[PDB]
Amino acid sequence: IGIRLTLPPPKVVDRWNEKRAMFGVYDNIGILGNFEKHPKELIRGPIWLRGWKGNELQRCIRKRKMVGSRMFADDLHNLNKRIRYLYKHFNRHGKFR
Amino acid sequence: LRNRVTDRYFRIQEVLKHARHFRGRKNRCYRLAVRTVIRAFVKCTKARYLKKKNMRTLWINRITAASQEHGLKYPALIGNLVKCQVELNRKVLADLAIYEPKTFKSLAALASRRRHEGFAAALGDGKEPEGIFSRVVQY
Amino acid sequence: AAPKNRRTIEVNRCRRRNPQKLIKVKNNIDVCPECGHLKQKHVLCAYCYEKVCKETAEIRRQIGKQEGGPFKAPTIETVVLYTGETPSEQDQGKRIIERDRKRPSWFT
Amino acid sequence: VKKGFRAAFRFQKELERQRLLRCPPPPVRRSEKPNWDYHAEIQAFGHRLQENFSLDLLKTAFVNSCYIKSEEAKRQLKSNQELSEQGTSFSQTCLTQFLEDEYPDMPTEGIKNLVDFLTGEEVVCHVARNLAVEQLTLSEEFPVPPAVLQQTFFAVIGALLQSSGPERTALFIRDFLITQMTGKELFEMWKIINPMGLLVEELKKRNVSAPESRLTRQSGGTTALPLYFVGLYCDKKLIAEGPGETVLVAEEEAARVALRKLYGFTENRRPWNYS
RNA sequence: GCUAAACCUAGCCCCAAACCCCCACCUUACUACCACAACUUAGCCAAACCAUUUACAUAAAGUAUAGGCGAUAGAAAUUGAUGGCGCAAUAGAUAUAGUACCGCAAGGGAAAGACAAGCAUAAUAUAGCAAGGACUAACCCCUAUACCUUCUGCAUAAUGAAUUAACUAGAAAUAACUUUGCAAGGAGAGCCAAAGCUAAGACCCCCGAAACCAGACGAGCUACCUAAGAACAGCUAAAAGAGCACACCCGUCUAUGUAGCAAAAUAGUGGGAAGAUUUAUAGGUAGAGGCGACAAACCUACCGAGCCUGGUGAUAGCUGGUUGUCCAAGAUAGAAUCUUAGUUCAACUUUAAAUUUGCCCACAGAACCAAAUCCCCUUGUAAAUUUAACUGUUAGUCCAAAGAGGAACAGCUCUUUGGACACUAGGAAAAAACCUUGUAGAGAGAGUAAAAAAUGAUCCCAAACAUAUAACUGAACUCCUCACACCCAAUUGGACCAAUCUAUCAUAUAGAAGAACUAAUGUUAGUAUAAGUAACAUGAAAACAUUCUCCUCCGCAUAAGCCUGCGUCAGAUCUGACAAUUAACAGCCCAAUAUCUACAAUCAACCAACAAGUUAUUACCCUCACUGUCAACCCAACCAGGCAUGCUCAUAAGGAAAGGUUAAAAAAAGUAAAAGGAACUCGGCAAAUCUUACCCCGCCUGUUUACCAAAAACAUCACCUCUAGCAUCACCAGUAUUAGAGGCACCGCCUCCUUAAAUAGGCUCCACGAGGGUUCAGCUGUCUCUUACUUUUAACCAGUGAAAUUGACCUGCCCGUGAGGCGGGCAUAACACAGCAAGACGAAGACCCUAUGGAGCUUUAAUUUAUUAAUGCAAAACCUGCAUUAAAAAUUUCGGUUGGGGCGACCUCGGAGCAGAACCCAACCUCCGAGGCUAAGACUUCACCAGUCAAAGCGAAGAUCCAAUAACUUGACCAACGGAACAAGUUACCCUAGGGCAAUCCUAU
Ligand SMILES: [Mg+2]
Ligand SMILES: [Mg+2]
Ligand SMILES: [Mg+2]
Ligand SMILES: [Mg+2]
Ligand SMILES: [Mg+2]
Ligand SMILES: [Mg+2]
Ligand SMILES: [Mg+2]
Ligand SMILES: [Mg+2]
Ligand SMILES: [Mg+2]
Ligand SMILES: [Mg+2]
Ligand SMILES: [Mg+2]
Ligand SMILES: [Mg+2]
Ligand SMILES: [Mg+2]
Ligand SMILES: [Mg+2]
Ligand SMILES: [Mg+2]
Ligand SMILES: [Mg+2]
Ligand SMILES: [Mg+2]
Ligand SMILES: [Mg+2]
Ligand SMILES: [Mg+2]
Ligand SMILES: [Mg+2]
Ligand SMILES: [Mg+2]
Ligand SMILES: [Mg+2]
Ligand SMILES: [Mg+2]
Ligand SMILES: [Mg+2]
Ligand SMILES: [Mg+2]
Ligand SMILES: [Mg+2]
Ligand SMILES: [Mg+2]
Ligand SMILES: [Mg+2]
Ligand SMILES: [Mg+2]
Ligand SMILES: [Mg+2]
Ligand SMILES: [Mg+2]
Ligand SMILES: [Mg+2]
Ligand SMILES: [Mg+2]
Ligand SMILES: [Mg+2]
Ligand SMILES: [Mg+2]
Ligand SMILES: [Mg+2]
Ligand SMILES: [Mg+2]
Ligand SMILES: [Mg+2]
Ligand SMILES: [Zn+2]
């Protein structure tokens, strides 16, 4: 048996808190603001991902370049190993040549 | 764990419910219930053909019994009722033999009559007048 | 060798619950007609035997307390007498093992 | 804990379903469960049978003295006695007429027995459960006792008669009560004992000597599964033939078949004409 | 009804921001207190080997450039810069914890907290993949060869699964296609643009080697060595690697044991036992290294190369797996390849799109030297070609036919035309390959197709029938009433969708993603089966004080090790509290300087030897502190094993071989045995008895393969050969009668009988041998030929209670097919218990082949001299740089078809029969050689790369890369001739991944 018996507590979502009521506001700051700013300049998050996209290999390479010299030793060694593996995989393994 | 099947129970019971009436461990253990249930449904599908074949052979047997009760084999009865243009099938012939003996007696008499007419005609020389029951009716 | 297939619960039930393996109901129990305790026919009433062994042990404790140490098997018969029982006329010249409780009704 | 809600609710519903198979609830009046309005229900009862019941008479044909008394006692209008009497009396008379005209030779004892069977509790309750009389009828005890269903059913027939006249009521009776004779043999409704005596009586009334019982056919005389075919005769002419395992039982069955043939109630009689 | 099943949070993951924190302790760490020093990543991995080589903001740009110009590598100038569609106790950190526990060590590394399977209630009744058609009826009747994966299909041919629950396997570009925006321009700079641009949508898995390299940890086992210690009774013999034989050490032969008492023991029988012996204690040698009386022996249970961490998610042309529903199209030309276990191209398949001919096909037509084939007008048809875009299959089996090879046979290799199979269904018995039949659902309707015999070895095999009119029976084929996408592998297209999160509703529309398990000897947890089976334990009586019977190479102490581990009390069937082991024994030491310090020990005296074994001066008049002290004990996971020394030598000390019973088999140990005494057997193994003789090998004692070989191997005195003229770390505080390295093995001598019978036995050279062979005599249950009794085991009662194994089983025999399960016969009420070993291909170890797997060994296989040593030349009597020669190593590889694998040939191109008549078609089948320029259209060696013909017109009559080159272009090798730039022999020590109807003849009529 892998199914619960009593009902879960009700997850109450407040669809009108501040974060949801104001979602998206200023996502047209460029078109409606004389192009002073750009939408990407509102993306809050990692230093090395604000307004950029890519597969895991490119993401790891970018992380190494921009914060590789600030990383803890073991995390950085893991990152280098990961880049090595992904290089081998994306460049030698796969259905399509 | 991001996504885990939360309802594997119902997918199991969909297959066990068809196995409660089995015998052994293969009525509560899925790994065996599945194989035997699948064999069960395959036989269930494939068995309709045999159902038709078997009911027809039962009817042929019952009709042979009834027709032998009146001194007349089964080849004669069917092969000489059609020569009288009676399209009674075999299900209803069996039902008549069991549940209406005298009607079947009459049908057997008719078959023997037509058989005799055929023998008499073939024994003769030429196209002498056809038998009183051997006259076909056209559409 | 080793088994080639698990044995099902059905075969195991036809073996384990076969009559030859069941515990038989005993046809030889009854009640001590006088004493009124359970007993088998060919065996002593357990309660009576225990109440006899207790007195035998007490008598033997007195015997040990009187003989002193080991290696003192007497060369005469022995008689045991309970309270208020003078040595009878037949028991003179036989060692007496005094006890300090009224003689049991079952001691004849 | 697996995160989710759908499987939990689905399992709760399945548990409730299982819990409503073991320990089912005590059955209760359909007039208490949800989705009930008496007026629409009674009007639909009318229109369903293809009959133009007068609404007031039909309303008072489903109310029983028990219900009136219980309402009077529970509080700290007409009842259906008269309609029930009219309906029962008319039903008896009309069934007698039907059976007499369909089966002329049958004796008055047999016709009265058939009429008691069809208007009895065993068949009236069956015809009253499968036409929603128990749902509309007012009483104390649920399920309504079969006697109360019977008296309410004939109250409804009485309302039908007082409303739409005799002929339509006769069609109603032909449609629901007489149909119950379908398949039943005669002596499954007219329960009798000592059939040979009754055969001898009827044959005497027609001035012919009592029948001689012979042994027509037999197989397995000595075994434990015999078959004796006993054939009554009446001055060298057969009038019946019966099977059995004992010769006594075969003679009894020969008497039963002879009685059926004389009373015109055979297995292959002209089937009742409903058109 | 038990067992269980359920839950939330304790916490954690990824971001953002901010730069983070009394005493004792480097000696033996956690100890109050005395005279040296630290300062290039190799290689797994790609190139399908491998050797140069191979990765550690945006844009310019994957451009310049580098590169066996292969795989791949790759700039710069300039440009400009508090949170969560995260986990929620098998997840998230390994975490309640780096604790418990494993390991000597480096190091490894957990678990968990809040009516599923299994059973009981309730054992079963002929028959059989356990179901289906059904039926009034559970069985009985008819039908019916388990699932996954791999091989051409596989009856199970083989692999995997006891069973439940949880967790467990498709990540992304280049183009294309679809839908939006804008459109000669698109885009929020860099880019593209001859309808394109911008955005989105779609597509590329999991587990597993032996290995390699680097840095740590290990000599508490074992090999050897060092320092300082210890043991060796008694007898015989007196200075001896002496004889018999205890302690001690080893481990010859047999039996027990084989998850055992023990991951190598027990009992007997054996070799040594004053020495080359054995042994306690501390130290040393460290992994291509150590050590080695060389056996590839040993270096912490597994060493032809330790172990741990890291590179490491090594790589794997090899094995195994790969998870919802439904539909549809869908299969066997060939070429090259260090290549035939694989890849690329083609052929075939699929989708989308464009266009118009495609298939069949008569008459005509295709050479000189039988079947048929090619080509098209019509005709029946509706398909075909072309374009854009991907994957997948590829060298299959059987049957008819024509050939080549082996007879015209060997169920034989190969080529060709056709069919079938790997797709449905019915028949010939079972039946992939023969005959009949396809497009799919419901029917309790119908018509047919194919389809029946004539006249040697367990146990024959449907039962029967000579003569009543020939028709009937028979499918998923066809018709009938209704409904329709609803029967192929690999692959490809499409329509739906379970559950979770997010946005908006507040189950739907969308967006997302750790998104679905009948299967990886998967992992974790639960419970089964074998199974209440195998195995284990407590001497007797009693008055619980005691007495009795029997046993021990045992016991007491110190040492080493361990650390409170049967003392009291109180709770239970082990938990807590309390208590204890008192120094005289043992450890913990020493003020400095100079001086000395020749002769053994052995009852130490006789003989005899060799292995040769502290004080004087100066300074100090201080006193007992500190620690060990227990036990039934330590190393072996808990234990018939291992454990140094002193003393008791059969016990003053210590213990208990039988839980109760009965006295079956088979098994184990022992005792006895008539007559005969090796006739057993490979052999006198075992046992009983104690004698003799020879032969082979080795001179002797000794040493060796811890755990299958103790030897005829190693070592060894003796002899011989080679090298070396000599200082303070080995040889060596040595010096040619010395030291090191080799061969051989003292010494002397030379450089026909046996048996009745027989394939066995019969350079000299004493002594010795658990060495090998033979013989005499004896002895005996080895045997002729077994038998009895005892003990353990055993069987039963009572307690405690495993493990391999297991798809499901409702688990028969015979014959046939290719066997408990299929077919045809036979048999058949259910159920324990004890036996047996014919069958369930019943549950480790070998042998053959393969891999452009791994690791070696040798070399006269290729490449090198980096390191060392000589020289030679420059550099200021020594070191630095360059060159040559060598040794020492280091890296690296082992082409293809094949008698029977090996031997040996051949490997590219060309011509003749197979392949009779367009094209093509194999051979280690059949027979032989070769190494002027421009330009419509075409042919081709079944791909590509190459190759071939050519009207007109103008002018004259064996690849790529590299080097030399101004050049016009040029060559050898690449002949393994689609070519690694340069690599052989071999693995009896090998390791991993895997695969496995007879020409010639024998015999009878
Ligand atoms: Mg049919
Ligand atoms: Mg490589
Ligand atoms: Mg955890
Ligand atoms: Mg964990
Ligand atoms: Mg259950
Ligand atoms: Mg089998
Ligand atoms: Mg298995
Ligand atoms: Mg040592
Ligand atoms: Mg891998
Ligand atoms: Mg391969
Ligand atoms: Mg299809
Ligand atoms: Mg043509
Ligand atoms: Mg069809
Ligand atoms: Mg839904
Ligand atoms: Mg998943
Ligand atoms: Mg599994
Ligand atoms: Mg057993
Ligand atoms: Mg036992
Ligand atoms: Mg002390
Ligand atoms: Mg002292
Ligand atoms: Mg002590
Ligand atoms: Mg003692
Ligand atoms: Mg004992
Ligand atoms: Mg015992
Ligand atoms: Mg003897
Ligand atoms: Mg020796
Ligand atoms: Mg020896
Ligand atoms: Mg027991
Ligand atoms: Mg067989
Ligand atoms: Mg048995
Ligand atoms: Mg290869
Ligand atoms: Mg290799
Ligand atoms: Mg040729
Ligand atoms: Mg060719
Ligand atoms: Mg070509
Ligand atoms: Mg020209
Ligand atoms: Mg080649
Ligand atoms: Mg070639
Ligand atoms: Zn008593």
Give yes or no for CB of B138 within 7 Å of strand E.
no
Give strand pairing partners of A9. none
In chain B, which residues have their Cβ closer than 8 Å to the Cβ of A2?
8-9
In chain A, which residues have their Cβ closer than 8 Å to the Cβ of D5?
7-8
Count of domains for chain D: 2
With respect to residue D182, please indicate whether it lies within any of the assigned structural domains. yes
Cα(B98)–Cα(B66) distance, rounded to whole angstroms? 8
Q: How do strand C95-98 and strand D212-219 relate by DSSP bridges?
A: unpaired
> Is residue B7 less than 8 Å (CB to CB) from chain A?
yes
Give strand pairing partners of C80. C97
Is C45 a known ligand-binding residue?
A: yes
Task: Say yes or no: D45 and D178 in one domain.
Answer: yes
Smallest Cα distance from D13 to chain B, Å: 12
Nucleotides of E under 7 A from a protein CB: 5-9, 14-17, 45-46, 55-58, 72, 83-84, 86-89, 91, 114-120, 123-124, 129-134, 142-144, 146-147, 161-168, 170-173, 188, 203-205, 311-313, 315-316, 344, 390-392, 425, 442-447, 469-476, 498-507, 513-519, 528-530, 532, 542-547, 804-811, 830-833, 840, 842-843
Residues 74-103 of B with CB under 7 A from strand E: 74-75, 78-79, 82, 89-91
Give yes or no for CB of B44 within 7 Å of strand E.
yes
Cα(D172)–Cα(D48) distance, rounded to whole angstroms? 12
Give strand pairing partners of D230. D215, D242
Task: Say yes or no: D136 and D98 in one domain.
Answer: yes
Give yes or no for CB of B5 within 7 Å of strand E.
yes
Counting ligands in written order, the one closest to the CA of C34 is: 39
Cα(D15)–Cα(A4) distance, rounded to whole angstroms? 12
Task: Say yes or no: D88 and D141 in one domain.
Answer: yes
> Resolution in A, one decimal?
2.9
The structure tokens listed for B93 are 């012939």
Cα(C37)–Cα(C91) distance, rounded to whole angstroms? 35
Apex D268 CA angle, D258 and D91, nearest 5: 90
Give yes or no for CB of C78 within 7 Å of strand E.
no
Determine contact, residues D242/D251, Cβ cutoff 8 Å. Answer: yes
Domain extents in chain A: 1-97
- Please choose, from the candidates D200, D204, D189, the residue with its C-alpha nearest in 3D space to the C-alpha of residue D254: D200
The structure tokens listed for A80 are 């280098």
Residues sharing a CB contact under 8 Å with residue D82, sequence separation 6 or more, in sequence order? D158
Residue A88's φ and ψ, nearest 5 degrees, are -60, -45
Apex A94 CA angle, A93 and B1, nearest 5: 95
Determine contact, residues D143/D131, Cβ cutoff 8 Å. Answer: no
* Domain end among D172, D193, D214: D193
Q: Of all helices (H) and strands (E), which one includes residue C39?
A: strand C38-40
Q: How do strand C29-31 and strand D212-219 relate by DSSP bridges?
A: unpaired
Q: Residue type for C18, please?
A: N
Q: Which residue of B has its CA nearest to D3?
A: B6
Determine contact, residues D108/D99, Cβ cutoff 8 Å. Answer: no
- Please choose, from the candidates D56, D34, D26, the residue with its C-alpha nearest in 3D space to the C-alpha of residue D43: D56
In chain B, which residues have their Cβ closer than 8 Å to the Cβ of C9?
25
In chain C, which residues have their Cβ closer than 8 Å to the Cβ of B24?
8, 10
A38-A41-A43-A49 Cα dihedral, nearest 10 degrees: 110
With respect to residue D25, please indicate whether it lies within any of the assigned structural domains. no
Domain extents in chain B: 1-139
- Please choose, from the candidates D149, D263, D155, D247, the residue with its C-alpha nearest in 3D space to the C-alpha of residue D206: D263
Indicate the SS3 state at residue C98: strand
Domain of residue D198: give its range.
194-268
Question: Does an interface of 3+ CB pairs under 8 Å exist between D and A?
Answer: yes
Q: How do strand C38-40 and strand D212-219 relate by DSSP bridges?
A: unpaired
* Domain end among D176, D193, D210: D193
Question: Does an interface of 3+ CB pairs under 8 Å exist between C and A?
Answer: no
The structure tokens listed for D125 are 């309750």
Task: Say yes or no: D261 and D149 in one domain.
Answer: no
> Is residue B45 less than 8 Å (CB to CB) from chain A?
no
Task: Say yes or no: D98 and D46 in one domain.
Answer: yes
Task: Say yes or no: D53 and D151 in one domain.
Answer: yes
Number of residues in chain D: 275
Give the DSSP letter of residue C81.
E
Indicate the SS3 state at residue A11: coil
Task: Say yes or no: D177 and D208 in one domain.
Answer: no
Sign of the torsion angle spanned by Cα atoms B108, B112, B113, B114? positive
Cα(B98)–Cα(B92) distance, rounded to whole angstroms? 10
The structure tokens listed for D238 are 């057969």
Task: Say yes or no: D52 and D119 in one domain.
Answer: yes
- Please choose, from the candidates D5, D228, D27, D251, the residue with its C-alpha nearest in 3D space to the C-alpha of residue D134: D27
Task: Say yes or no: D48 and D111 in one domain.
Answer: yes
- Please choose, from the candidates D86, D262, D48, the residue with its C-alpha nearest in 3D space to the C-alpha of residue D163: D86
Q: How far is CA C85 from the centre of its chain?
A: 27
Task: Say yes or no: D72 and D202 in one domain.
Answer: no
Is C53 a known ligand-binding residue?
A: no
